[PDB]
Amino acid sequence: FKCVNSLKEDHNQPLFGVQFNWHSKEGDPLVFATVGSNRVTLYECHSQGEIRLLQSYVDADADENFYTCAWTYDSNTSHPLLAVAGSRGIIRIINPITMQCIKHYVGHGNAINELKFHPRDPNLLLSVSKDHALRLWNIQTDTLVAIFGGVEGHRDEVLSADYDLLGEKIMSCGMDHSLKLWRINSKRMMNAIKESYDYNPNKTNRPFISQKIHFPDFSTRDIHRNYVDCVRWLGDLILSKSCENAIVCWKPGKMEDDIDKIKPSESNVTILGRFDYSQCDIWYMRFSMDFWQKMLALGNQVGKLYVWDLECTTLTHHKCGAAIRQTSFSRDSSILIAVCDDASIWRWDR
Ligand SMILES: CS(=O)(=O)c1ccc(-c2cnc(NCc3cccc4c3CCO4)n3cnnc23)cc1
Numbered sequence: 001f002k003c004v005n006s007l008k009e010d011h012n013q014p015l016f017g018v019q020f021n022w023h024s025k026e027g028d029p030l031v032f033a034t035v036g037s038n039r040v041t042l043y044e045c046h047s048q049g050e051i052r053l054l055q056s057y058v059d060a061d062a063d064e065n066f067y068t069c070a071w072t073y074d075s076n077t078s079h080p081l082l083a084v085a086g087s088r089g090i091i092r093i094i095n096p097i098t099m100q101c102i103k104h105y106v107g108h109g110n111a112i113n114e115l116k117f118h119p120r121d122p123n124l125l126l127s128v129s130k131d132h133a134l135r136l137w138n139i140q141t142d143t144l145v146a147i148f149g150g151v152e153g154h155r156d157e158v159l160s161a162d163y164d165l166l167g168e169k170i171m172s173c174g175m176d177h178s179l180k181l182w183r184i185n186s187k188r189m190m191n192a193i194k195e196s197y198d199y200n201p202n203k204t205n206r207p208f209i210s211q212k213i214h215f216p217d218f219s220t221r222d223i224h225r226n227y228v229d230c231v232r233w234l235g236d237l238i239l240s241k242s243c244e245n246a247i248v249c250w251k252p253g254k255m256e257d258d259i260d261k262i263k264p265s266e267s268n269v270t271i272l273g274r275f276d277y278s279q280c281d282i283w284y285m286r287f288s289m290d291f292w293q294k295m296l297a298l299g300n301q302v303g304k305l306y307v308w309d310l311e312c313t314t315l316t317h318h319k320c321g322a323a324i325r326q327t328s329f330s331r332d333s334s335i336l337i338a339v340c341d342d343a344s345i346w347r348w349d350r
Contacts, residue, residue, distance in 0.1 A: 004049030150214035181218035299324020
């Protein structure tokens, strides 16, 4: 990788999120979104390192702080859609062509730390909050499918979550140092999702009833000794990090235990490896994988970018000195974008 371009957003506030749109066809524009302050900005990647500013969404509330964004598509037209959330705990659905807000979802009792769309169902949106819960939404029928939390749920702010390859299960993590498994391929959850597609408030005077999931399918506090701020699936394995200068690769149960045989009472975990690095010991720093799950990237608090081939390289620039909060690979893995605390954007081309 070589640094081909850099720019700074006029708001001069930290950028906490970056996502390339992985739903665009070959020959169609290479687009990424950035989130910082009360803003969402779209950019296009052109040849010779050129970055073109497309459009910006400025929220009506000046005190809103966006922390996360995620792309999806309309199941009928295949047209792109962009979800955003942050400090106000309100999910906003944006039309990326006009950059106008289509609709919003109110419900979480505090800020939203992450948004993730289901890998097979573009209408299923997962949100994780400072209110100690996760929420699953159906954005086609505007319904709250389920709430994940309660007695055996997270005991502090939830920081991250990820669906597995097929979207049969979710792994969540947060300030309570725990990593929790939630199965969504159970008879209960499959019927709840089916019911959410049948609901229409105009054909009944009764509200839609959400599932209250009080108990996870697995839980551990034996991987990290501080806040767990990023979690991703790698097949049946889990990659997770704290502020302890390492990404840990692990699995529930003993070495030969199958993930779908794991019981909620499982007391063991198996450590399979660790990715070591330096000067990334502050809270709120995300790692990312490319679409192929062949590359892993993580930025540090002094502007250094670490890249590992999963089948270590350190990327530096004399003008890049601020903390890299999140990175994103283009679908073909030829471009890597990094966003920083000083509102700067960095483009690395393979
Ligand atoms: C410059 S400062 O004032 O020191 C500062 C620093 C961090 C935050 C902050 C960032 N991000 C989130 N949530 C999203 C999140 C969650 C997990 C990992 C992760 C991210 C974004 C990158 O990595 N926050 C929730 N509450 N505060 C924050 C706010 C102010």
